[PDB]
Each structure stands twice: as structure tokens, then as C-alpha cells.
Design an enzyme around this catalytic site. Structure first.
Site, mmCIF file in Angstrom:
data_model
loop_
_atom_site.group_PDB
_atom_site.id
_atom_site.type_symbol
_atom_site.label_atom_id
_atom_site.label_comp_id
_atom_site.label_asym_id
_atom_site.label_seq_id
_atom_site.Cartn_x
_atom_site.Cartn_y
_atom_site.Cartn_z
ATOM 1 N N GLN A 183 -0.952 7.594 -6.014
ATOM 2 C CA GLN A 183 -1.223 8.087 -4.659
ATOM 3 C C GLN A 183 -0.026 8.679 -3.932
ATOM 4 O OE1 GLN A 183 -4.159 8.191 -2.251
ATOM 5 N NE2 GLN A 183 -4.773 8.876 -4.299
ATOM 6 N N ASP A 209 0.870 -1.188 0.000
ATOM 7 C CA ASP A 209 0.000 0.000 0.000
ATOM 8 C C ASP A 209 0.902 1.231 0.000
ATOM 9 O OD1 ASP A 209 -1.964 -1.890 0.634
ATOM 10 O OD2 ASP A 209 -2.570 -0.884 2.504
ATOM 11 N N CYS A 228 -6.491 -2.893 -6.759
ATOM 12 C CA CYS A 228 -5.558 -2.977 -5.642
ATOM 13 C C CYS A 228 -6.444 -2.924 -4.405
ATOM 14 C CB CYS A 228 -4.481 -1.879 -5.743
ATOM 15 S SG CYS A 228 -5.121 -0.260 -6.260
ATOM 16 N N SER A 229 -6.173 -2.055 -3.430
ATOM 17 C CA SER A 229 -7.104 -1.939 -2.315
ATOM 18 C C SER A 229 -8.174 -0.897 -2.626
ATOM 19 C CB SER A 229 -6.404 -1.605 -0.999
ATOM 20 O OG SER A 229 -7.371 -1.624 0.050
ATOM 21 N N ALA A 230 -7.747 0.336 -2.870
ATOM 22 C CA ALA A 230 -8.705 1.381 -3.216
ATOM 23 C C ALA A 230 -8.979 1.421 -4.713
ATOM 24 C CB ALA A 230 -8.216 2.735 -2.755
ATOM 25 N N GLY A 231 -8.097 0.830 -5.515
ATOM 26 C CA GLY A 231 -8.289 0.874 -6.969
ATOM 27 C C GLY A 231 -7.813 2.182 -7.584
ATOM 28 N N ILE A 232 -6.869 2.849 -6.916
ATOM 29 C CA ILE A 232 -6.379 4.140 -7.424
ATOM 30 C C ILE A 232 -4.868 4.295 -7.456
ATOM 31 C CG2 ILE A 232 -8.580 5.302 -6.960
ATOM 32 C CD1 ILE A 232 -7.343 6.623 -4.520
ATOM 33 N N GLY A 233 -4.184 3.896 -6.388
ATOM 34 C CA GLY A 233 -2.751 4.146 -6.312
ATOM 35 C C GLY A 233 -1.967 3.207 -7.207
ATOM 36 N N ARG A 234 -1.959 1.946 -6.810
ATOM 37 C CA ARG A 234 -1.246 0.933 -7.572
ATOM 38 C C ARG A 234 -1.918 0.713 -8.914
ATOM 39 N NH1 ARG A 234 -1.041 -2.683 -2.217
ATOM 40 N NH2 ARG A 234 -2.980 -1.451 -1.980
HETATM 41 O O1 825 Z 1 -9.592 6.612 2.928
HETATM 42 C C1 825 Z 1 -8.508 7.133 2.664
HETATM 43 C C2 825 Z 1 -8.263 8.591 2.981
HETATM 44 C C3 825 Z 1 -9.305 9.361 3.515
HETATM 45 C C4 825 Z 1 -9.107 10.711 3.806
HETATM 46 C C5 825 Z 1 -7.873 11.287 3.550
HETATM 47 C C6 825 Z 1 -6.825 10.537 3.022
HETATM 48 C C7 825 Z 1 -7.022 9.183 2.732
HETATM 49 C C8 825 Z 1 -7.416 6.296 2.057
HETATM 50 C C9 825 Z 1 -8.035 5.284 1.059
HETATM 51 C C10 825 Z 1 -6.951 4.613 0.245
HETATM 52 C C11 825 Z 1 -6.519 5.190 -0.952
HETATM 53 C C12 825 Z 1 -5.514 4.603 -1.723
HETATM 54 C C13 825 Z 1 -4.942 3.381 -1.317
HETATM 55 C C14 825 Z 1 -3.829 2.827 -2.170
HETATM 56 F F1 825 Z 1 -3.227 3.885 -2.722
HETATM 57 F F2 825 Z 1 -2.916 2.248 -1.390
HETATM 58 P P1 825 Z 1 -4.311 1.701 -3.542
HETATM 59 O O2 825 Z 1 -2.977 1.438 -4.207
HETATM 60 O O3 825 Z 1 -5.296 2.495 -4.349
HETATM 61 O O4 825 Z 1 -4.911 0.474 -2.921
HETATM 62 C C15 825 Z 1 -5.385 2.763 -0.024
HETATM 63 BR BR1 825 Z 1 -4.705 1.210 0.652
HETATM 64 C C16 825 Z 1 -6.390 3.397 0.689
HETATM 65 C C17 825 Z 1 -6.632 5.626 3.143
HETATM 66 C C18 825 Z 1 -5.286 5.965 3.324
HETATM 67 C C19 825 Z 1 -4.526 5.354 4.329
HETATM 68 C C20 825 Z 1 -5.132 4.401 5.156
HETATM 69 C C21 825 Z 1 -6.480 4.062 4.990
HETATM 70 C C22 825 Z 1 -7.241 4.675 3.987
#
Ligand code: 825
Ligand code: MG
Ligand code: MG
Ligand code: MG
Length: 285
Positions: A264, A183, A217-223
Site C-alpha cells: 500500500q 497501518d 491485517c486491517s484491509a488484508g492488502i498492505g501489510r
Molecule cells: O478505504 C480506503 C480508501 C478508500 C478510498 C481511497 C483510498 C483509500 C482505505 C482502506 C485501507 C487499505 C489498506 C489498509 C492497510 F494498508 F493499512 P492494510 O495493511 O491492508 O491493513 C488500511 Br488500514 C485501510 C483506507 C485508507 C486510510 C484510512 C482508512 C481507509
């Protein structure tokens, strides 16, 4: 031969950004400049339990709809890259209650491949881990069987059989699972990432003969964003007369018209540049 100077210009630019420590500034420009479109459907109370994260939603204009009269909602977006002539579905890692929806989407969209870039432990265990323990998604009337898998150091490729229990049609789905991308992290190396991407490409999963690949991925945006951006930019560098004309920032902004938050971290943006330059050199070498 003409490409040598072009690649030198790309490498120089990359090094200038590294030397100045400007990746975060460029990444923040992208965030600042990114599209903002409504996600009204995602935000409906009935859909709250269909989103892993309150703050990550598909835009209404590009969301994938389930072919349901009941509730058509899944946290998934269609990224349609017109110049590159490629489409992708980016989606969150399925939840315990949305694994049936996920496979319904794969079925309805006629996808041949699923690219998974995270690990369970998050994400539901949405595919079978043993041949003899198939999964039935009773809500969407789908059956999923593990046919084989090939486990490598940094990724695993699984052959799955997806059956529509209503029609008894079966399809082979390839599952490309990159297992070493944390992540908010980066892949093991550009080489590892590119080898993985090239395997996905070689499989035919990305071809227009099939529905869009499903990437998550998890959120479907970063990776997922990083993966799709690199693939698209590599396509563009092959397509264009001058590979140095491909502006990765511009392409990412285009992709962000279709789903929020793609890439991300500043290091993922850096990685996308590095992987694209290295991959293009390889392809065009
Ligand atoms: O919910 C999230 C958030 C909410 C408000 C402000 C900033 C972020 C993200 C949602 C989010 C967004 C992106 C990813 C990721 F980038 F890792 P991905 O590669 O898309 O799975 C993940 Br995992 C999670 C988050 C970030 C850290 C901990 C838990 C949740
Ligand atoms: Mg956010
Ligand atoms: Mg066994
Ligand atoms: Mg059978």
C-alpha cells in the site's frame, strides 16, 4: 560462491533506486499495471456489512467461498503462486459480525496457521485473550480456546484450539501475531520481520500438508501483501538458479492478479526489496 555477484547486483539495484528516490515511481507503475477484475459478489447489498472498507474487495475469480447455502461471502482471496508452489489466503481483519465466518474459513480451508499483522485498535477481538474465557461462534458452531502464548518484543505466537462443535473434531491453530507494524507503515526492522517470517515457516504452517495459511491485517492488502510477497520472493530466490532473476515487481503484479492493492505504500515496496535481499543472503549464506 556464485551467489556473491548476484547479491551484489541486487544490492546495487536497490541502492540505485534509493539514490534516485524512485520507489514511489516504481510503486505507481505497479498500481498502473495491476489487474482489474470484477468484485460483483463483494458489492452485493447483502454483503455490504461483511466488508470493512467499501474500496477493498476480493475479486470474484479468486474469492474464498464459505461452505454455506445461506451466504458464502467473506472478504478473503486465495493467492496461488504457481512457480513458488505456495498458496495464501489474504483476508481483512474480522469485523464484529464476521468472526464466525473467519473461523469457518480457517476450518473449511484446513489452515494450520493464521498470520495477523495489525492490532485491535481496525479489527475485532476474534480470539480469546484468556485460557478460561473461550469463545463460541454460535453462527458457525465453532469453539476457540487459547491454549498458550509466547509474547516477544515484536510478535506473539499463540496456540489455539479450534473445535467444530458439530463433529467434535479439534484442531491446533497457530496464531502468529506481528504486533509492531502500523497501518501504512513498515515492520520494526528487516531482521524483526524475517525472524517472524522464519518462525511461521518453521512451524510448518506454510507447508502443502495443510490448507493455505490465513494472513490478515486491517484491509488484508498492505501489510498482508508485503508479508506474502516477501515469502514468495524468498521461495523463488531459493528455487531459481540465479536469485537475481527474481523480479519482485513482476511477482507482486502476479500476486495482484488474485487480490487488489497488495502493498500500500512506496516504503512497503522498498521494504519488501530490502527484506527479500537480506533474507535470501541469510538463507543462501
Ligand atoms: O478505504 C480506503 C480508501 C478508500 C478510498 C481511497 C483510498 C483509500 C482505505 C482502506 C485501507 C487499505 C489498506 C489498509 C492497510 F494498508 F493499512 P492494510 O495493511 O491492508 O491493513 C488500511 Br488500514 C485501510 C483506507 C485508507 C486510510 C484510512 C482508512 C481507509
Ligand atoms: Mg484503493
Ligand atoms: Mg490468566
Ligand atoms: Mg475440549
Amino acid at each position: 560462491a556464485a551467489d556473491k555477484l548476484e547479491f551484489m547486483e541486487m544490492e546495487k539495484e536497490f541502492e540505485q533506486i534509493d539514490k534516485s528516490g524512485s520507489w514511489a515511481a516504481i510503486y505507481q507503475d505497479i498500481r498502473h499495471e495491476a489487474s482489474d477484475f470484477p468484485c460483483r459478489v463483494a458489492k452485493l447489498p447483502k454483503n455490504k456489512n461483511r466488508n470493512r472498507y467499501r474500496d477493498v474487495s476480493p475479486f470474484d475469480h479468486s474469492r474464498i467461498k464459505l461452505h454455506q447455502e445461506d451466504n458464502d461471502y467473506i472478504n478473503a482471496s486465495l493467492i496461488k503462486m504457481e512457480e513458488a508452489q505456495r498458496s495464501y489466503i489474504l483476508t481483512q481483519g474480522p469485523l464484529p459480525n464476521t468472526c464466525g465466518h473467519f473461523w469457518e474459513m480457517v476450518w473449511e480451508q484446513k489452515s494450520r496457521g493464521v498470520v495477523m499483522l495489525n492490532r485491535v485498535m481496525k479489527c475485532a477481538q476474534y480470539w480469546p485473550q484468556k485460557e478460561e474465557k473461550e469463545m463460541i461462534f454460535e453462527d458457525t458452531n465453532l469453539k476457540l480456546t487459547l491454549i498458550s502464548e509466547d509474547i516477544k518484543s515484536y510478535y506473539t505466537v499463540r496456540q489455539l484450539e479450534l473445535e467444530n462443535l458439530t463433529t467434535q473434531e479439534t484442531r491446533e491453530i497457530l496464531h502468529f501475531h506481528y504486533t509492531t507494524w502500523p497501518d501504512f507503515g513498515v515492520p520494526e526492522s528487516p531482521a524483526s520481520f524475517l525472524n517472524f517470517l522464519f518462525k511461521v515457516r518453521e512451524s510448518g504452517s506454510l507447508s502443502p500438508e495443510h490448507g493455505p495459511v490465513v494472513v490478515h491485517c486491517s484491509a488484508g492488502i498492505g501489510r498482508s501483501g508485503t508479508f506474502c510477497l516477501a515469502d514468495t520472493c524468498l521461495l523463488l530466490m531459493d528455487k531459481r538458479k540465479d536469485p537475481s532473476s527474481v523480479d519482485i515487481k513482476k511477482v507482486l503484479l502476479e500476486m495482484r492478479k488474485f487480490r487488489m492493492g497488495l502493498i500500500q505504500t512506496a516504503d512497503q515496496l522498498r521494504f519488501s526489496y530490502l527484506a527479500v535481499i537480506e533474507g535470501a543472503k541469510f538463507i543462501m549464506g
